[PDB]
């Protein structure tokens, strides 16, 4: 699953187009701040106001890895 496409259609909804942090904090650099493990769990689980489980399996895996790679 195209990680950037996922993020660019599942996360930008709150994080904003560039993931610079609109209705949610900036995660374009979340790969710098946190590791794929952390991010993966957060995608699967949630964070604060984030519903979580927005992406799962290959979706969330691809997301987290790509996010780690975004850094
Ligand atoms: C709006 C309903 C959200 C969607 C859709 C996604 N996220 Fe999110 N995320 C959101 C918020 C508001 C927060 C922080 C808590 C708060 O209430 O302010 C987050 C947090 C994350 C984090 C951690 C960032 C941090 O806590 O500093 C990550 C790594 C993250 N979110 C990733 C992420 C991805 C990749 C999503 C799409 C699969 C996604 N989020 C959707 C709000 C929302």
Curated annotation (Swiss-Prot):
User: What does the sequence similarity comment in the record state about its family?
Assistant: Belongs to the cytochrome c family.
Q: What is this protein called?
A: Cytochrome c-553
> Which residue ranges run through the membrane?
none
What UniProt keywords apply to this chain's record, in alphabetical order?
A: Cell membrane, Electron transport, Heme, Iron, Lipoprotein, Membrane, Metal-binding, Transport
User: What organism is listed for this UniProt entry?
Assistant: Sporosarcina pasteurii (Bacillus pasteurii)
Residues that coordinate or bind heme c: 11, 14-15
Asked if Ligase is a keyword of the record, the answer is: no
Q: Which residues of the full protein are shown?
A: 22 to 92 of 92
Q: Looking at the keywords, is Iron present?
A: yes
The lineage's top-level taxon is Bacteria
The role this protein plays is: Natural electron acceptor for a formate dehydrogenase.
Tell me the compartments it is located in. Answer: Cell membrane
Q: How does it sit in the membrane?
A: Peripheral membrane protein
């Amino acid at each position: 699953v195209d990680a950037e496409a996922v993020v660019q259609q599942k996360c930008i909804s709150c994080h904003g187009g560039d993931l610079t942090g609109a209705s949610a904090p900036a995660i374009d650099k979340a790969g710098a701040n946190y590791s794929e493990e952390e991010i993966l769990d957060i995608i699967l689980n949630g964070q604060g106001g984030m519903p979580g489980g927005i992406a799962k399996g290959a979706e969330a895996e691809a997301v987290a890895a790509w996010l780690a790679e975004k850094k």
